[PDB]
């Protein structure tokens, strides 16, 4: 940005150095004010003009604005090219780049609307008369009765208003802190709840009277690949628009306006659409027979600029056939309003406002007008059937009208069309001749420019023989001729045509994100039947034998959108908690897997991408804990559920739990007992595939139909007793019958396309756009995942050894609770300190804290800030002195039973409590006459054989420990320290016979090793039990740990 500043300085020097000194003293404080105002007026698209300005300096200002505009535009495009390819950048760069490209798109839209106002309507009158009379003939062929205006009391207005207000309040239920303009909207919605009939009167008055509307705001959703607009509407108009949306869909569903080929429907998720499309391709009359030169053609395409090229007057003329005319005038009047972005106002006159409530109707009706242009009236009448007996989706009247025409399968998702043709030899030759008559090809150039699917192998995708390529070009030409280019436009570069012939053994398409390859049984090898996931087995309806296979993959745009979502998650700041990142990863991973259920297993690049993104997410937390890279890191830090203090991260990968990390220990009155309890369970095994889901769905709904038919005749109401065999099963879920809002949700028609079009109204992204829980039910279960996750990590006692739990002295876990969704970083680090601060995690570098015996592996400031707070004010030395004084008061009483003549407390040096190179004795006992000593043995060892080495002096030393997950065995530690400190030239002990008592604070363990005179060992066992139960300094340490961890009971 410094080069632009040097350029501005050079421009100002070239301006000021020409004028003399009496004008240098004036124009240094004259030009600089409006110099920024001219650039501001350019950026706000305001025409810059000021009187009293000379013309060469005005041309200099215009050259300055033009040069900075070119620099700014190329900088914005280069910044978008940096973040599109995946290069890392600061978040403020993307936040400014979104505004720059928002202003550029607004300048483009304001230009193209004025170009439409200047050049006139781009549609001719004859094409308008053609589509108008076509719609008239179609609606008179079906006897469609128009949608009436709701007069005074339709007796369903209350339920529709309730549904509209629920869909309006569905967005604001995420966060509990809102803005004032949002509080005003919630207040208006609550006032609409309080008085429904006044709200209905306001809606009907705005319908019959109002034609002017407040300005609609625009924002852009920041996808890394493609910008998408979100519109903001005034709430008083928004309530009326939502009620109009509900009433139009509920009337159009009853009047049967939409033919069954128009998709999405309310009864199918899009993978069921793909499955039924594959079954419809399979079940045709002799579809794979190519012995006489027949061909199959699969066209898929998209209507380019369908949303921007709708003329509003033509829309009103086509809309007045189906509703009341005031309703059509209200639907046209909302589209002609001023769009604002923060400085920029422009009116809308061409193209619809896609972010409206009722706009979900407008796209679905207008695109119906496209079906009369593409499919033809005769073939649409043969597909839909009579009005008194309509056909099903991908079904015909008879077989003769099925095979009477080549255009024999048709489907339209919102703007993507999928057509399937069956040609003979002579029809294909005639179509290729009709193509080559107008478009000759002397050099065979129609191979270059052919869109093909590179994700498949070379023998698996389309083989480009010349006849099949010419047939595909002819098919796309014949479809493109039927559409007037002023109304809609299809393009070859955005389309795809697959051909199945003698030279092409398999058929390809892309639909609903799925890459599908269909391959017949009779075009391949023998029976072998090795079962694979992502392989659908296709069978006939009549003979029920196998005919073909369907191979599923995930397309490239879904994987790129997922990788952009991972890059959005990795844009979290340093103050962001770890749990928010893990929750975003879990939401994204469920939104990937539960939609692409059976096809993730078949594609290998997505399985590599999931593991790569998961390791980047774990590395984001690894760098956040410590700056230095760890050599190892336990997965039980991550995959522990949030109830036990972990993160609850979902798994897609091959992670093996290492041995000797499933061990745990427990100390009781008989001593220290050890116990020993593998792969982390994956997500894809806990989700049902789509094929078994559809077969089981059909089976359970057939059984419900038979049980309902039996229950009607017996005067019996079905209860939970008869449907407890098939709970959770089928789609929609049987669970949706047993719900409180049956009469409320039964009036909601067309909910799936509305849920899909919520993306132009809400600023946040929407995973699970393809479903709604109140209508489908719940389509996955993850309690088994958490159960197997707790079971796979070695149990709760196996997890809690990593978690500093035994430093808190709670007897159980079940009565405990956390102080309140999210856990902070300090509490997480102090909780998982025994498994992070280990020797085999940060290799080599270790230090010691000053006033404690805590060994810090590496350096962790986020744990140091807690270990200073816990162990402040010499608590280590106070605990040591308290244990020494309590044991001295133990040895003070019961004097004659052990023949003790003098107990002596040694002068303890104030650094002795935490130095670990050497030690010294703490409590010295003098024998009255003589004491028999035993061999050096453990505290719990009872096989003691005493020697004749009678000694008088006895010494007792107290040692403290702060261990970790692998080194916390206090018995071998006390034995090693005894054998070290009794066999060295630096430690000082006045007696060769003694004992060392070791206490580990991080797990609260205690043991002893050394010599034993008679009567000393049960006394020391009971004394140390009494101390570990009743030391007040240990109680201060425990209450400080429980205060730091925020863990209560």
């Amino acid at each position: 940005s410094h080069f632009d500043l040097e350029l501005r300085a050079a421009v100002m020097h070239d301006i000021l150095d020409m004028m003399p000194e009496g004008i240098k003293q004036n124009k240094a404080r004259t030009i600089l004010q409006h110099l920024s105002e001219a650039w501001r007026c350019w950026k706000a698209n305001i025409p810059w003009k000021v009187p009293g300005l000379p013309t060469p300096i005005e041309n200099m200002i215009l050259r300055y604005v033009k040069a900075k505009a070119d620099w700014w535009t190329n900088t914005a495009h280069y910044n978008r090219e940096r973040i599109r390819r995946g290069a890392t950048v600061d978040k403020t760069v993307c936040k400014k780049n979104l505004g720059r490209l928002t202003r550029l798109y607004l300048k483009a839209e304001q230009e193209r609307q004025h170009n439409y106002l200047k050049d006139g309507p781009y549609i001719t009158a004859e094409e308008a008369v053609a589509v108008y009379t076509t719609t008239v003939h179609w609606l008179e062929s079906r006897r469609f009765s128009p949608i009436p205006f709701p007069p005074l009391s339709y007796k369903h207005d209350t339920k529709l208003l309730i549904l509209a207000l629920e869909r309006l309040k569905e967005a604001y239920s995420v966060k509990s802190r809102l803005n004032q303009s949002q509080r005003e909207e919630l207040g208006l919605i609550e006032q609409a709840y309080d008085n429904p009939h006044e709200a209905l009167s306001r809606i009907k008055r705005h319908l019959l009277t109002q034609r002017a509307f407040k300005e609609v705001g625009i924002e852009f959703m920041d996808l890394y690949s493609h910008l998408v607009p979100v519109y903001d509407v005034e709430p008083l108009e928004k309530i009326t628009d939502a009620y109009l949306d509900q009433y139009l869909w509920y009337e159009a569903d009853k009047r049967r306006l939409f033919p069954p080929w128009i998709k999405p429907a309310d009864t199918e998720p899009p993978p069921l659409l793909v499955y039924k499309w594959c079954q419809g391709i399979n079940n045709l009359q002799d579809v794979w027979e190519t012995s006489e030169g027949e061909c199959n053609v699969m066209l898929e395409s998209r209507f380019e600029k369908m949303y921007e090229k709708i003329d509003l007057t033509l829309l009103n003329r086509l809309l007045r056939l189906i509703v009341d005319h005031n309703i059509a005038d209200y639907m046209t009047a909302k589209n002609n309003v001023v769009i604002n972005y923060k400085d920029m106002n422009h009116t809308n006159s061409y193209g619809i406002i896609r972010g409206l409530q009722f706009a979900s109707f407008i796209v679905q009706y207008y695109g119906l007008v496209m079906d009369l242009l593409v499919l033809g009236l005769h073939r649409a009448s043969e597909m839909a059937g009579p009005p008194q007996m309509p056909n099903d989706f991908l079904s015909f009247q008879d077989i003769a009208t099925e095979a009477a025409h080549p255009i024999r399968l048709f489907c339209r998702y919102i703007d993507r069309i999928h057509i399937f043709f069956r040609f003979t030899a002579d029809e294909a030759r005639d179509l290729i001749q009709r193509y080559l008559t107008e478009h000759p090809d002397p050099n065979n150039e129609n191979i270059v420019g052919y869109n093909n699917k590179k994700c498949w192998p070379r023998d698996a995708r389309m083989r480009l023989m010349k006849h099949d390529v010419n047939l595909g070009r002819a098919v796309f030409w014949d479809i493109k001729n039927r559409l007037p280019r002023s109304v809609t436009t299809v393009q070859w570069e955005n389309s795809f045509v697959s051909v199945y012939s003698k030279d092409n053994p398999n058929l390809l398409f892309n639909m609903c994100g799925f890459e599908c390859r269909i391959l017949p049984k009779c075009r391949t090898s023998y029976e072998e039947f090795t079962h694979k996931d992502g392989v659908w087995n296709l069978q006939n309806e009549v003979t029920k034998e196998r005919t073909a296979q369907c191979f599923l993959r995930v397309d490239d745009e879904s994987m790129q959108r997922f990788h952009n979502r991972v890059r959005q998650i990795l844009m979290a700041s340093g103050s962001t908690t770890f749990t928010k990142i893990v929750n975003k990863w879990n939401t994204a991973l469920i939104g990937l897997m539960t939609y692409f259920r059976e096809a993730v297993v078949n594609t290998q690049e997505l399985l590599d991408l999931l593991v790569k993104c998961e390791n980047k997410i774990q590395t984001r937390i690894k760098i956040g804990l410590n700056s230095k890279m760890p050599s190892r890191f336990p997965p039980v830090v991550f995959y522990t559920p949030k109830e036990l203090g972990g993160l609850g991260m979902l798994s897609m990968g091959h992670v093996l739990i290492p041995q000797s990390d499933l061990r745990w220990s427990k100390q009781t009155d008989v001593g220290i007992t050890h116990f020993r309890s593998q792969l982390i369970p994956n997500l894809y095994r806990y989700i049902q595939p789509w094929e078994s889901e559809f077969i089981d769905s059909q089976r359970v709904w057939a059984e419900y139909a038979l049980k309902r038919q039996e229950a009607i005749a017996q005067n019996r109401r079905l209860t939970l007793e008869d449907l407890e065999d098939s709970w959770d099963r089928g789609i929609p879920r049987i669970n949706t019958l047993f719900q409180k809002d049956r009469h409320t949700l039964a009036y909601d028609k067309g909910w799936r396309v509305r849920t899909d079009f919520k993306q132009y109204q809400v600023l946040k992204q929407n995973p699970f756009w393809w479903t709604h829980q109140r209508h489908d039910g719940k389509l996955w279960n993850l309690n088994n995942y958490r159960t197997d996750m707790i079971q796979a990590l070695g149990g709760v006692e196996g997890i809690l050894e990593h978690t500093l739990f035994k430093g808190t002295y709670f007897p159980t876990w079940e009565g405990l609770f956390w102080e309140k969704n999210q856990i902070p970083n300090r509490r997480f680090t102090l909780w998982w300190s025994p498994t992070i601060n280990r020797a085999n995690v940060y290799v080599g570098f270790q230090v010691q804290l000053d006033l404690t015996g805590i060994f810090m592996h590496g350096k962790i400031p986020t744990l140091k800030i807690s270990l200073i707070q816990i162990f402040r004010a010499h608590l280590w030395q106070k605990i040591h002195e308290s244990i020494v004084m309590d044991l001295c008061q133990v040895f003070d009483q019961e004097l004659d039973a052990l023949e003790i003549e003098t107990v002596q407390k040694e002068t303890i040096h104030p650094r002795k409590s935490y130095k670990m190179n050497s030690s010294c004795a703490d409590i010295l006992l003098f024998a009255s006459y003589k004491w028999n000593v035993s061999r050096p043995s453990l505290l719990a060892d009872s096989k003691d054989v005493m020697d004749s080495t009678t000694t008088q002096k006895y010494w007792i030393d107290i040692q403290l420990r702060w261990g970790d997950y692998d080194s916390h065995d206090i018995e071998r530690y006390a034995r090693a320290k005894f054998l070290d400190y009794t066999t060295d030239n630096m430690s000082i002990y006045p007696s060769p016979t003694g004992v060392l008592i070791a206490i580990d604070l991080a797990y609260n363990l205690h043991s002893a090793y050394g010599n034993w005179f008679p009567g000393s060992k049960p006394l020391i066992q009971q004394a140390m039990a009494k101390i570990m139960k009743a030391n007040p300094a240990l109680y201060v340490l425990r209450e400080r740990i429980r205060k730091g961890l925020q863990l209560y009971s």
Binding site: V611, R632, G653, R685
Partner: peptide, 28 residues
């Protein structure tokens, strides 16, 4: 075993997709 999540390519031989997936009982 230094962390290092691995890919599932080739590491599924006897594991299907629908296996070990259970459904809930009706509540009360």
């Amino acid at each position: 075993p230094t962390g290092e999540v691995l890919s599932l390519v080739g590491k599924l031989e006897g594991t299907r997709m629908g296996d070990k997936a259970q459904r809930t009982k009706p509540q009360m």
